[PDB]
Structure 1
Amino acid sequence: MFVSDFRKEFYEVVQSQRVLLFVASDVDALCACKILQALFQCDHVQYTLVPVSGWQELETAFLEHKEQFHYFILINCGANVDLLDILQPDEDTIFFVCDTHRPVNVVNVYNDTQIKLLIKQDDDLEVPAYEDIFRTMRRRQRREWEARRRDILFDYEQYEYHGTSSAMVMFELAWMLSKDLNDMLWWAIVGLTDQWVQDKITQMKYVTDVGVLQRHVSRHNHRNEDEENTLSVDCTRISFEYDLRLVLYQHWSLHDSLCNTSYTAARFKLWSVHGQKRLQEFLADMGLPLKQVKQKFQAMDISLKENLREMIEESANKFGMKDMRVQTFSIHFGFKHKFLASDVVFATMSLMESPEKDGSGTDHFIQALDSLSRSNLDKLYHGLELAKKQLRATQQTIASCLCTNLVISQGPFLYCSLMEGTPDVMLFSRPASLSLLSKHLLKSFVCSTKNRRCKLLPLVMAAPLSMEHGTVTVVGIPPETDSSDRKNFFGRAFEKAAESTSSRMLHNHFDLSVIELKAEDRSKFLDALISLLS
């Protein structure tokens, strides 16, 4: 069932109870977890928090914890599968699901007693009616009904996508509880910006949600400040910004940010030998000295920093980059700490997807989660350093793939693969960073090629996972277009291709468009996908 009011029939229920949080390892999940943590700590709710990153891990943790806890909250996981089938719970347990994944599984939708969904009912949802999904001429009519059922269920389950941010949902709950702090609002903003950075949502939906959060920012600012008398410099001040699309440009030199932003790198073809000259054309059009552009931004001359955004916008317009400016937010506190929401997103993501072989992925999750609090600001800066390394490695990998021409058409989709032992393949072994790399690589490819048909294709990308088990991760990306809905069918396509091939596919990740394959299975699996997409 959908929860109609989070306050009464979710929060006031669990407020009297011991709770278990399962949280996915993504930045939106981390922000929603932080908001809910702060609420529970205000109300002395005895919660336990468990990270998870796949179905096997969630099943293991639930089997470990099922006896002691009756109330469970799943953040950014569980909505798009039958939780009762997967977990096999006792009937007295209750699962709250604040998950952005769409479409919601019909069993979770119509299970009234046990599965409760912390999902907005005014999100883009098209759930089929109950009578269409659940129960001689009567036999013929029944078989016709079953044919209708399979057709409508395939139409419902074909495309997966993402709804409103879980962090935004939790901040809505905090606002209804009248316990919303400025830091909670910042976590909500970072949660939305995670979806925008990873291209999980459309630009229109992102603009709408930014319009929602603008009102909350204005309310929080005018809560205790006006234009006549102001707060201490120590206090956090969140400001709406119509800022630049360039990544981490306030902590870098502008040259590095123009080099490693996927947008500008794809436009100017900076992987190519000619791309640096095109970048120099752009910089000379702006009139910025190269010794200033290659200097760190905080050390750049303030005469140049005065109107840099207008300069970059108006040069980008005539160079063909039509949407260089983006609606976003920034947070200021103290004298010297200034971050964009995209900066916090990249830092936390790099901490979580860090390639270091220390401890465990749960350890990297813990470092990422700690970095979202201002008492652990050093972790945030360290995450920014890791983001520098990650973005440089991303551009190196894209340059390698395009120069050696690993990205190759195979009919209805482009195909690419990373070989073992190549530079910085370890950084993209993990599925989430691989999905991000595939998106950036597809943007670079469609900006590079002259073939108008190839600009319309989706991308399938693979990389090694475990040589000892002989497995590869595989991800599927929809076509990269300006007006895409960011819906993709590769979940069901992978499932149906694997079933039609009897392939050894482990479906452990929460996105259905991310899978693990036994490596030798890839040839017949790819052939099946080619025959399927046709």
Structure 2
Amino acid sequence: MFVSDFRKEFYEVVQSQRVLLFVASDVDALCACKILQALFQCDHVQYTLVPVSGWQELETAFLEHKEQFHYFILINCGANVDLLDILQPDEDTIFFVCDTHRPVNVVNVYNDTQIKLLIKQDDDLEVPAYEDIFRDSEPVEQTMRRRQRREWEARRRDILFDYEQYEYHGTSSAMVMFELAWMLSKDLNDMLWWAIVGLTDQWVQDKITQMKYVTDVGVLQRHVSRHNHRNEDEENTLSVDCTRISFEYDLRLVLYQHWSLHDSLCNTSYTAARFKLWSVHGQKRLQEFLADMGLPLKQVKQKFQAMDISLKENLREMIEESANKFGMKDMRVQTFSIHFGFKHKFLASDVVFATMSLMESPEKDGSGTDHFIQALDSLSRSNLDKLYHGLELAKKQLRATQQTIASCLCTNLVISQGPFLYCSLMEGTPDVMLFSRPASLSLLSKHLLKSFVCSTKNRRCKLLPLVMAAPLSMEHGTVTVVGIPPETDSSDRKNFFGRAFEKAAESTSSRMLHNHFDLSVIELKAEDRSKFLDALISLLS
């Protein structure tokens, strides 16, 4: 069931109890976690944080802890599966699920005793009616009933199929948690920023539509203005500090405030794809764009911070003018920035890329948990050192992304299988270890598809979805496979590959695991890849 009162039904229930907090490995989840942690600190809630990358870790951790805890909180995991069936818990165990994954499992929706969904009830939700999916030598009296039961069960299969076909995401969990803090009158300025970063994570990863993003930006604008007014109230005692969040109609250029304009232009998907920067011709057109701006060469190639103050104040208008001249209409974006002092100013997307690079780091200097915690720590104002380190890792990730895309396109490795495009990375692919985790591979695939649609002349191919594979375990001969929807500005960002992969694996008896919280990312036996993809082609044709 859904929670109608976050205070009485959730927070006041758990704050006096011992709580196990499961947190998925995405920035929105980290941000939601930071907010809840700050609340739990204020109220001295006894809890244990268990970071989880996928279902196996969660299920294992649950077995390890189910005896010492009866109150569980799941952040960005659990909503899209029959949680009671998978975990097989005791009757007294309560699960609070704050997860953006859609669709919500019907059992999670209609269970009243153990599943408590911390999900806004006015989210995009189209749940089936209870009557359609749950029930309570023979004469005609009995056989007619049998016939009706069979027809009901048949409709039920169709109804649940339609309901579970497309995966997508609802409102940011960080935003939901911020609302809780607001209700508790404990919404610190830091929490509002974390809510913003969480929303921005969804946007960066194309998890939500442009319309939903703009709508939610509008909501957060209200809170930013309320906080600004609060920071001017002399009688206010809550979160009295100098930390200022500001709404920004800023440039669609990644990390541009932390390296050169040239680097940002070359490593932003929007411009890299549209200028076709994998080609010399493309690189030439970019130089013509920079020439049309009339900006000096030194000012473009040097770090942004060392730019003439007069040029910084005109850059938004200058770049947008040249952009309009080249027919680019979306150089400007609605977002937020946070200011600490001096040059310590960060756009929301900067923090997303930094936090993501820390969390998804493939380094051996620490385990996945260490990196997760480092990412979680980087969100605290207390020290910006981790954030700045994250920004350096982000630059590397972005450069490697551009190089990988160039290799894929110039080596002609993005090939239509009919109903979908296919491409893959191999063990010998440079920087493959930067793209071997679900999150990193999925984001790479979306960036690659964006560049591909700009590159291709084939009108049919422009509208195709993409399937992308990378090496998982060489020892066990497994690969990770991701599926993403067709790339369009107006996309509803809904994804059918989860159930498509499932049916393809079943009809071929392929050895496959749905370990990621998104069903559109699977682990597959390399030996089965051939028949698996063959079945998938037939299925989607």
Which sits farther off after the overlay, 359-368 or 187-196? 359-368
**Take 1:102 and 1:232, find their aligned partners in 2: how far apart are those partners?**
34
Query: How many matched pairs?
Result: 534
Asked if 2 retains the 8 angstrom alpha-carbon contact of 1:32 and 1:191, the reply is yes
**Take 2:84 and 2:241, find their aligned partners in 1: how far apart are those partners?**
48
Which sits farther off after the overlay, 66-75 or 9-18? 9-18
- CA shift at 1:8, angstroms? 1.3
**Take 1:229 and 1:125, find their aligned partners in 2: how far apart are those partners?**
39
1:349-395 C-alpha deviation (Å, 9 max, x unpaired): 00011121223111110110110001131000000000010000000
Asked if 2 retains the 8 angstrom alpha-carbon contact of 1:415 and 1:459, the reply is yes
**Take 1:376 and 1:524, find their aligned partners in 2: how far apart are those partners?**
51
In the TM superposition, structure 1's runs of 4+ consecutive aligned residues that sit over 4 Å from their partners are: 226-234
Asked if 1 retains the 8 angstrom alpha-carbon contact of 2:230 and 2:236, the reply is no
Q: C-alpha root-mean-square deviation of aligned residues, in Å? A: 1.8
Show structure 2 runs of 5+ residues with no match: 136-142
Q: Percent identity?
A: 100
1:199-225 C-alpha deviation (Å, 9 max, x unpaired): 100000000000000010001111122
- CA shift at 1:228, angstroms? 16
Which sits farther off after the overlay, 221-230 or 484-493? 221-230
SS at match of 2:116: strand
- CA shift at 1:227, angstroms? 14
1:7-47 C-alpha deviation (Å, 9 max, x unpaired): 11111111211111000000000000000000111111111
Asked if 2 retains the 8 angstrom alpha-carbon contact of 1:22 and 1:72, the reply is yes
Asked if 2 retains the 8 angstrom alpha-carbon contact of 1:233 and 1:334, the reply is no
- CA shift at 1:229, angstroms? 15
- CA shift at 1:336, angstroms? 2.8
- CA shift at 1:294, angstroms? 0.4
1:81-121 C-alpha deviation (Å, 9 max, x unpaired): 11111111111010000000000000111111111100011
Asked if 2 retains the 8 angstrom alpha-carbon contact of 1:233 and 1:335, the reply is no
Asked if 1 retains the 8 angstrom alpha-carbon contact of 2:72 and 2:96, the reply is yes
Asked if 1 retains the 8 angstrom alpha-carbon contact of 2:245 and 2:336, the reply is yes
Asked if 1 retains the 8 angstrom alpha-carbon contact of 2:23 and 2:76, the reply is yes
| Match in the other structure for 1:129 | 129
1:327-358 C-alpha deviation (Å, 9 max, x unpaired): 00000013331000000000000001112122
SS at match of 2:383: helix
Asked if 2 retains the 8 angstrom alpha-carbon contact of 1:225 and 1:231, the reply is no
**Take 1:100 and 1:347, find their aligned partners in 2: how far apart are those partners?**
22
Q: What is the TM-score of this pair, normalised by structure 2?
A: 0.97
- CA shift at 1:235, angstroms? 1.4
**Take 2:270 and 2:418, find their aligned partners in 1: how far apart are those partners?**
26
Which sits farther off after the overlay, 351-360 or 194-203? 351-360
| Match in the other structure for 1:514 | 521
**Take 1:331 and 1:309, find their aligned partners in 2: how far apart are those partners?**
18
| Closer, same or farther: CA 93–268 of 1 in aligned 2, 3 Å | same
**Take 1:232 and 1:442, find their aligned partners in 2: how far apart are those partners?**
43
Which sits farther off after the overlay, 407-416 or 222-231? 222-231
Question: 180, 194, 200: which is aligned to 2:207?
Answer: 200
**Take 2:237 and 2:325, find their aligned partners in 1: how far apart are those partners?**
41
SS at match of 1:62: helix
| Closer, same or farther: CA 234–15 of 1 in aligned 2, 3 Å | closer
Asked if 2 retains the 8 angstrom alpha-carbon contact of 1:234 and 1:334, the reply is no
- CA shift at 1:420, angstroms? 1.2
Which sits farther off after the overlay, 460-469 or 297-306? 297-306
| Match in the other structure for 1:109 | 109
**Take 2:531 and 2:466, find their aligned partners in 1: how far apart are those partners?**
18
1:248-282 C-alpha deviation (Å, 9 max, x unpaired): 00001000000000000000001112121111011
SS at match of 1:49: strand
**Take 2:127 and 2:405, find their aligned partners in 1: how far apart are those partners?**
39
| Closer, same or farther: CA 282–130 of 1 in aligned 2, 3 Å | same
- CA shift at 1:232, angstroms? 13
Asked if 2 retains the 8 angstrom alpha-carbon contact of 1:233 and 1:333, the reply is no
Asked if 1 retains the 8 angstrom alpha-carbon contact of 2:73 and 2:96, the reply is yes
**Take 1:299 and 1:335, find their aligned partners in 2: how far apart are those partners?**
13
Q: What is the TM-score of this pair, normalised by structure 1?
A: 0.98
Which sits farther off after the overlay, 359-368 or 144-153? 359-368
**Take 1:268 and 1:229, find their aligned partners in 2: how far apart are those partners?**
51
- CA shift at 1:311, angstroms? 1.1
**Take 1:308 and 1:373, find their aligned partners in 2: how far apart are those partners?**
30
Asked if 2 retains the 8 angstrom alpha-carbon contact of 1:20 and 1:48, the reply is yes
| Closer, same or farther: CA 267–242 of 1 in aligned 2, 3 Å | same
Asked if 1 retains the 8 angstrom alpha-carbon contact of 2:231 and 2:240, the reply is no
**Take 1:389 and 1:402, find their aligned partners in 2: how far apart are those partners?**
20
Asked if 2 retains the 8 angstrom alpha-carbon contact of 1:270 and 1:276, the reply is yes
**Take 2:81 and 2:235, find their aligned partners in 1: how far apart are those partners?**
54
- CA shift at 1:230, angstroms? 15
Asked if 2 retains the 8 angstrom alpha-carbon contact of 1:35 and 1:170, the reply is yes
Question: 424, 430, 435: which is aligned to 1:417?
Answer: 424
Which sits farther off after the overlay, 302-311 or 145-154? 302-311
1:40-70 C-alpha deviation (Å, 9 max, x unpaired): 1111111110100110000010000000111
**Take 1:175 and 1:242, find their aligned partners in 2: how far apart are those partners?**
26
**Take 1:354 and 1:321, find their aligned partners in 2: how far apart are those partners?**
34
SS at match of 1:331: strand
Asked if 1 retains the 8 angstrom alpha-carbon contact of 2:79 and 2:105, the reply is yes
**Take 2:462 and 2:268, find their aligned partners in 1: how far apart are those partners?**
20
- CA shift at 1:234, angstroms? 6.8
Asked if 2 retains the 8 angstrom alpha-carbon contact of 1:21 and 1:73, the reply is yes
Which sits farther off after the overlay, 311-320 or 347-356? 311-320
| Closer, same or farther: CA 226–307 of 1 in aligned 2, 3 Å | farther
